[PDB]
UniProtKB/Swiss-Prot annotation, chains A, B, C, D:
Annotated disease: Intellectual developmental disorder, autosomal dominant 74: An autosomal dominant disorder characterized by global developmental delay, including delay of motor skills and speech delay, intellectual disability, behavioral abnormalities, and subtle facial dysmorphology.
Full protein name: Heterogeneous nuclear ribonucleoproteins C1/C2
Cellular compartment(s): Nucleus
Subunit field text: Tetramer composed of 3 copies of isoform C1 and 1 copy of isoform C2. Assembly of 3 tetramers with bound pre-mRNA gives rise to a 19S complex that interacts with HNRNPA2B1 tetramers. Component of the 40S hnRNP particle. Identified in the spliceosome C complex. Interacts with IGF2BP1. Interacts with DHX9; this interaction is direct, enhanced probably by their concomitant binding to RNA and mediates the attachment to actin filaments. Interacts with PPIA/CYPA. Interacts with YWHAE.
Secretion signal span: none
Family named by the database record: Belongs to the RRM HNRPC family. RALY subfamily.
Recorded consequence of changing residue 5 to R: No effect on sumoylation
Organism, scientific name: Homo sapiens (Human)
Post-translational modification, as annotated: Sumoylated. Sumoylation reduces affinity for mRNA. Ubiquitinated and degraded after nucleo-cytoplasmic transport by YWHAE.
Amino acid sequence: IQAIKKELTQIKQKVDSLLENLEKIEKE
Amino acid sequence: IQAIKKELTQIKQKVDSLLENLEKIEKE
Amino acid sequence: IQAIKKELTQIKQKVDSLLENLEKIEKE
Amino acid sequence: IQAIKKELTQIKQKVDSLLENLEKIEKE
């Protein structure tokens, strides 16, 4: 459970980063 | 944006549904 | 594992579908 | 495309890494 909860939370955060990037181009 | 944005939000919701599944532990 | 593996496989499949839709640039 | 494309491929690979981790079952 706990390690997969961390990895899935990292997926939501990377998928949110692509929303942030699409609102301009490729933000870093 | 809008099409990819809706689908990225769907990926977050499926990944969050996966968090809710793991919390049952050793289920289906 | 088995259902979680199927859910994660569907994330790869939807995420790959967004590559296909991005390649058109002007489709939804 | 190219940035979002690279980053969706990073989602596929992080989701695939989760399959490889789930195959241990008793560890992480």
